N, C-alpha and C. Protein backbone atom coordinates (compact mmCIF):
# COMPACT_ATOMS: atom_id res chain seq x y z
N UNK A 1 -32.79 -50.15 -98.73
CA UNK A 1 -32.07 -48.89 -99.08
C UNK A 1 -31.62 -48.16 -97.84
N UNK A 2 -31.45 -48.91 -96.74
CA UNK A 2 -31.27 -48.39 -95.69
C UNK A 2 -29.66 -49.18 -95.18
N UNK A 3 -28.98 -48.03 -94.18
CA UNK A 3 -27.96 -49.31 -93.67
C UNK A 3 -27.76 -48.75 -92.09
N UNK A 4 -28.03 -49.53 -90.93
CA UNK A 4 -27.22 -49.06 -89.76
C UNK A 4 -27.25 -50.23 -89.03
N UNK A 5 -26.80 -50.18 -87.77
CA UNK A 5 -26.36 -50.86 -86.84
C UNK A 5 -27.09 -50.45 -85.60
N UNK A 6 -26.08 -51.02 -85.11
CA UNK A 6 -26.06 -50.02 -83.24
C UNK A 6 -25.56 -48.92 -83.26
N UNK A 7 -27.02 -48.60 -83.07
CA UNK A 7 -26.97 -47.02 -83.31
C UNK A 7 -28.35 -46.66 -82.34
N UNK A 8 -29.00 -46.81 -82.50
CA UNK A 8 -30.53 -46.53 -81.86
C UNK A 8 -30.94 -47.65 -80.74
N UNK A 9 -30.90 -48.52 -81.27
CA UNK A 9 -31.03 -49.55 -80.10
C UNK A 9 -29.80 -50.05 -78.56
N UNK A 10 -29.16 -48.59 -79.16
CA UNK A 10 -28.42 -48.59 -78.11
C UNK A 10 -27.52 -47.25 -77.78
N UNK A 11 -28.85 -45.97 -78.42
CA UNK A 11 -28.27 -45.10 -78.27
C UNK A 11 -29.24 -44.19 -77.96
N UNK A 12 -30.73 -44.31 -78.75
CA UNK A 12 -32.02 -44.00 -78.30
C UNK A 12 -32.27 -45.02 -76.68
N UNK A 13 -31.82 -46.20 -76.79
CA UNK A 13 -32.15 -47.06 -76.25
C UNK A 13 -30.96 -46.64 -74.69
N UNK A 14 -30.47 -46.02 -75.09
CA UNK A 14 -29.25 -45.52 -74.15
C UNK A 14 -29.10 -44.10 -73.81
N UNK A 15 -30.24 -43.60 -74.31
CA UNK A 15 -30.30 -42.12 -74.09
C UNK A 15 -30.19 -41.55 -73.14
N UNK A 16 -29.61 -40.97 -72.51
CA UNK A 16 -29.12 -40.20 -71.01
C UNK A 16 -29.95 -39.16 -71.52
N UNK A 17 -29.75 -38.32 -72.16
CA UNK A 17 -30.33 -36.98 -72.56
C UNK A 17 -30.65 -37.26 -73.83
């Protein structure tokens, strides 16, 4: 029931701030 992508693993994962 869930849906994402690249999103976190490359955005948490890419976090500058």
């Amino acid at each position: 029931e869930m849906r994402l992508s690249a999103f976190f693993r490359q955005f948490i994962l890419q976090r500058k701030k």
